[model samples]
Target: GLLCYCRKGHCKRGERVRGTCGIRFLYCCPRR
Candidate 1:
């Protein structure tokens, strides 16, 4: 099966990450 990855490297604005569904993914804060 094809899998989608959402990790530290990803999550940038406009970067689409499959988190159950595709959304405008971004990590505003890290280790907060």
Candidate 2:
């Protein structure tokens, strides 16, 4: 999993980053 950007929208400033092992841009955002 690889997040395109480290910042995950707004997850508590310093703690704002995507966390998905082997995650990619196409599949980074969480699905509903």
Candidate 3:
């Protein structure tokens, strides 16, 4: 899985899984 930042509920193919820096973060895997 990979960690990424989300903006306004958008995660760019990623899924919301956690929070960081007062913003929502996402976890995405290549297989699914």
Candidate 4:
């Protein structure tokens, strides 16, 4: 899979995630 940039538009090599019903799911790379 390709690296998905964060909403900040910077890829800090971190993770992007969302939570639903106390469950956290990873979707893409996060930013600082």
Candidate 1 Cα deviation (angstroms), residue 26: 11
Best by TM-score: 1
The lDDT per prediction is 0.43, 0.34, 0.43, 0.38
Ten contiguous residues minimizing lDDT sum, candidate 1: 23-32
State residue 3's C-alpha deviation in candidate 3, in Å: 2.7
Q: Could you give me the TM-score of model 1 versus the true structure?
A: 0.24
How do all the candidates rank in terms of TM-score, highest first? 1, 3, 2, 4
Screening candidate 1 with a backbone cut-off below 3 angstroms (N, C-alpha, C), the clashing residue pairs are none
Pull out the clashing pairs in model 4. none
Clashes of each: 0, 4, 0, 0
The residue-by-residue lDDT of candidate 1 on 1-32, one tens digit each, is 24344556465554454453225343332321
As a whole number from 0 to 100, the lDDT of residue 11 in candidate 4 is 25
Candidate 4 similarity to native, TM-score: 0.16
Between prediction 1 and prediction 2, the one with superior TM-score is 1
At residue 14, candidate 4 shows an lDDT of 61
- Point out where model 4 deviates above 4 Å: 8-32
Model 4: per-residue Cα lDDT over 1-32, one tens digit each: 34453233322356554322222323454444
TM-scores of the candidates in the order shown: 0.24, 0.17, 0.21, 0.16
Candidate 1 error regions (>4 Å) = 1-6, 19-32
**Which residue segments of model 3 deviate by more than 4 Å?**
9-14, 20-32
